[PDB]
Symmetry: D2
Subunit: 400 residues, 4 copies
């Protein structure tokens, strides 16, 4: 309430701090939105974001590590100037890679903005405290290459998440939801090797790798009837031959599989493997099945963090109702990944979403959800009961 320095006042201060930074946060958005960059090539975005935190006053009060483990990833940290337990480490993630051809059709410029905004708001609320604040470290991580590769996984492998206690990010969508079901994903490239022959003269001396590709497609297609409705299989024939006068000796398929858990994903992947090896057996070709570098995990929900986020969203006026490398993060750190409406009916990964992601209209919705994240971070800092419940829900759901 209106008490000396209540939690409510700290939440208000975080909101006022985000409002105060609205103009430079929107410039941050537009600098990324207007210069879209693909996975692992976000050199401009990396420049913009590192400069953003280096310039936050007082300059150098954010400790900024550019080129953190990846050339376009960065890390930025702030903690109250204090000294003598263990400090609470709260992480905020920024995404900023675009999509080929259509630009920021997933609003990743606003994910960068919302992670920066929420971290500014937590710092400003903690600087507004008179008595020494509890020991907290605000950590911002720039995570490149969400659409391809999975920069958070590169960062997990580097140990970047091993000391975080809770991690926050949010994603622009078509409605406001504290959690939506993101699924595990496994990528594969399938290559078939046969034996060239002149189809005009001696076709029976060939081993037809195009046949292998089509049979694999047929094999997977009838299998769809026995997939679970939550399972997904999608793929293309990237190479299906070069000229009709030669029985093709090479073919190449590229496929994705998705399922709501890793146990199901491995069942689905094994059935697909059988389908690919069947096509080799039937055609007389050999086959190479090369899995992707980084399987994406499903996102593990956190009930306690979920409820505390929705309560803050309600106060802010928020009404509530694929796959991401945030799933891998959520398996090693309790986290939340809310989706938020930005005033558009367009769907993600379409050109009209690129328009909405860059719009002035989206800015209000983006800063509002950033306020919700910061208030929730303040919840975790000042409610030890919540932190333990968060940890309890994290340990329990990990039993899977």
């Amino acid at each position: 309430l209106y008490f000396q320095g209540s939690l409510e006042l700290l939440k208000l201060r975080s909101a006022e701090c985000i409002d105060e930074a609205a103009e430079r946060l929107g410039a941050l958005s537009r600098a990324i939105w207007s210069q879209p960059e693909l996975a692992y090539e976000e050199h401009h975005a990396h420049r913009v974001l590192t400069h953003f935190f280096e310039r936050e006053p007082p300059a150098a009060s954010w400790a900024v590590q550019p080129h953190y483990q990846l050339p376009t990833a960065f890390r930025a940290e702030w903690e109250p100037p204090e000294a003598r337990p263990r400090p609470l480490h709260l992480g905020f993630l920024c995404e900023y890679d675009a999509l080929p051809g259509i630009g920021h059709a997933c609003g990743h410029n606003l994910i960068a903005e919302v992670g920066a905004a929420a971290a500014l708001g937590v710092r400003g609320a903690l600087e507004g405290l008179p008595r020494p604040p509890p020991p907290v470290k605000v950590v911002v991580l720039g995570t490149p290459a969400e659409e391809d590769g999975g920069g958070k996984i590169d960062l997990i492998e580097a140990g970047a998440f091993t000391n975080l206690d809770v991690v926050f990010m949010a994603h622009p969508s078509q409605e406001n939801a504290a959690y939506l079901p993101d699924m595990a994903e496994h990528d594969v490239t399938v290559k078939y090797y046969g034996k060239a022959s002149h189809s005009a003269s001696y076709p029976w001396e060939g081993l037809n790798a195009l046949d292998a590709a089509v049979l694999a497609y047929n094999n997977l297609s009838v299998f769809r009837q026995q997939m679970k409705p939550t399972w997904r299989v999608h793929g293309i024939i990237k190479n299906g031959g070069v000229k009709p006068n030669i029985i093709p000796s090479y073919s190449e398929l590229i496929y994705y599989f998705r399922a709501p858990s890793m146990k199901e994903l491995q069942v689905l992947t094994k059935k697909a493997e059988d389908c690919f090896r069947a096509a080799a057996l039937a055609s007389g070709c050999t086959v190479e099945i090369k899995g992707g570098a980084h399987d994406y995990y499903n996102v593990l929900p956190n009930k306690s963090l979920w409820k505390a986020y929705m309560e803050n969203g309600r106060k802010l006026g928020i009404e509530f109702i694929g796959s991401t490398d945030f799933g891998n993060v959520s398996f090693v750190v309790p986290g939340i990944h809310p989706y938020f409406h930005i005033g558009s009916n367009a769907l993600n990964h379409t050109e009209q979403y690129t328009e909405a992601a860059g719009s002035q209209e989206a800015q209000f919705y983006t800063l509002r959800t950033a306020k919700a994240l910061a208030m929730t971070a303040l919840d975790v800092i000042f409610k030890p009961e919540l932190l333990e419940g968060i940890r309890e829900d994290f340990k329990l759901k990990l039993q899977e």
Copy 2:
């Protein structure tokens, strides 16, 4: 020529003997044609043919063994009443099984007739000899179940062909040819076993044996592009499920494969096996691949017997241009299997061929080809140079 008892006179006598028997030979044809019987059920045909040879005058001069190794097979033998090398054993085959639904749509009634006629003609020509005839045994074998099962193979397994020196038969067709390419054949029944489930509720708990059948079909179909043009693959889905509400747990396919040699047939069969096992692997079903009881061999040509037959056919006015268990015979005894026109344009295995096979018109053509066979048998008896050349061509072509 007009010499004492030249070979030419003996050939004339065999022709006159067949002409003399034309009425009872045609009654033999009509008795089988008018009462068609299927493989291994030719009880009436077996009765007709055994009675035919028992009644040839003088009665019992043909030594007749009814129910010879098979209930509807028979054996009939005649040799000149003589005594003291090795006698020449010349075999003549009678077929007499019909086709389901359409009756004697392959003219098998005329194969019975032509084998009987040729054997009568050889005996009559040898009885016309004054001086003691060379030692010869005329052997007639009734071989049931040509269209299904392969009665000649049952008879080979019983040893019926191990003492024959040359074997003759002929087959009504659409033109006169001393030899046509009959191919090796392998039959298979394929059964897939999956796991039933309610497709309405839990289809993903099923293993779909109908899928296996369709994938095998697809696998074989793309393979056609790499078959040799002489290869043949034909098959049906005999069982493809029972009701749509249950994921089928059983499916059944029936296939035939044909190739011009046993070496090629085994290559084709192995590629098909891969196709069937691929469908099991892709679908999660198990599979049973049960080969037929009797593979049919291709028919081995005999150049020497071929040329001597055509020379006799020319003198008679004959102008010259699938798979059968005669192929298996031709691998163990030098033989010929000429095809003969019967005055019809109809194709074998059609209803109009049943009409032609029963027609009065066909009788002239049938007796004419029987004359050609008997004259050729007389060639082998009285030309030791031909017998050795026949044996030479048989040993040489067996190198395969």
Copy 3:
């Protein structure tokens, strides 16, 4: 409460009446369970149920019409002996057809029991009223052939539902739910006509109707990737040829399609039709696509009836969380179709569910849900606000 003759007392009386009838209700269950009968052949079940209502005391107080529009359907009615608006007509449905081979693996014996029990309970509660009861007619309809054919649709076509105001039934399942999503369904038989030919000699003169069946299967299979996850396609190749020596001239497929609305079902059906006609075009065959006699509709929910049912279920101790011809009923009369747990983990349409459906354990759960239905019927009788809300929700959801 404990008031003169409150609604609560009437609900208690309906429960006590069902308890009083428990022994004869269970005998009714066992008489159907132990003599399973298939769609339109439920002659014993029809005898059992008509006799049940004719024997309810005082005898003939239920007005019973055997052989009502269908040989095994029946209608039974009771109303308070009263006289001088419009009477409320409340319908209760009894199902009683079994499944081939496995008997009452859907618990339809308990659907018969629960519809009878609920109607007895409403009558007993209304006979317990001192002052004249409001004008109500309790209607029981025996609806045969739910698993195949759709007896409720036969009955709709006869006008049986045109004067009902609300209709009640319940279905044994694996949990207690006031509503579960039953989908629209369309059945089709597909027949392909080609041209026979001897595959041994002239396969190129055939038009292969087995090919048509396999291509249709392939066409539908790749289409699965673009179906909605709620859509269902299931089918078998009932006839796929007869013998491999003849290019098949006939093939036959049987398929079901399901979608959550009639608009979606027609989209799905049209895409399938394209798949079937494509297979004819590719193969050179003609095709006949014969839709089923009775499309099943999805079940239209009724929010008001839903909430009033759950409130009664809670008081009774009930804890809450395919396609049926009840969907067609729910499009013409406001209705509910709750599912209820019967003390088993077995799934419907399995043999172990037949065991549970016949068990003594199931009887407690069956009578409890019948109590819930009767109390809800009493809700509609004595709450005009509920009746209008029920009608409002019915008109609104019909806008689809």
Copy 4:
């Protein structure tokens, strides 16, 4: 015989003239073989061959038209310096385009050589005549782009063949045959157009053009069972999608069809068209079926020219036993297209055939067949009975 200037002496003189030119003919071969060029890009070959005929002594005695209708085609003519019926026009064809990657793997350098050699030999035999020679025009046509495009067809369209009476060429192969069955050919490019959608979110909003490609492949594959054994279908999936996250909206197939006559080719092409349009219908895509620029015709045999060629080949020591745009020529001018062994077991269109085509060993065989062609041209010049029989066989076989 040894008569004044018999035909035999003229044939000998043509052989001696070819022997005299062997060194420069082999240089001609090596100049093309060592600098392989593809269809319509044979600028060096065109330079070599035009220069060859311009340099034949006396210089300019061959009337040479470079860049004749096509940039790399040429025409060269010689006739006896004479004057006052109609002159006999005899054509000789030179091919000279190579194959991508493997060079002159069809020996086209030797087709150029053999057509040049035969024309030199006819001229030299006619210059050796004392009395005025009959009026003859020796025409050499360079026909580019045999492997792709069909330069003879470009030349037919320009009228180049309308005044020729007989046309000669020969093709290096694996044995010596006066005629081998070259088939009619039709090329098609098939493009499918669907509707992109995000397969991750809304795959059911896509229309899958990759599905169309696979279904067309399936459609054609089952059709193989009903093709004639002489028919050929071969094709590739040139474009089968770009990335798995987007339902492909475009696919592209490239196919060839071959049959022994134009009537059969059109039947085969129509059945394939049905297969392509079926895939569009099943998938919801539209389709464009674009036939090739130039259908190749089968080669029409000429019995009279055939027999006269073989008789000359025998005297020379020659022992006798796909598709080409020479087929289109043979439909408008009586011609022959013998194949000749060149001392190699390698197959055409393989790298080892490129070795043989360039070998010193091949030169003897090439000049020998050129001698046979020239002698046959002398046959036509000096046997009016042969010319009429040639024309008779040409008119008769055109009835097709």
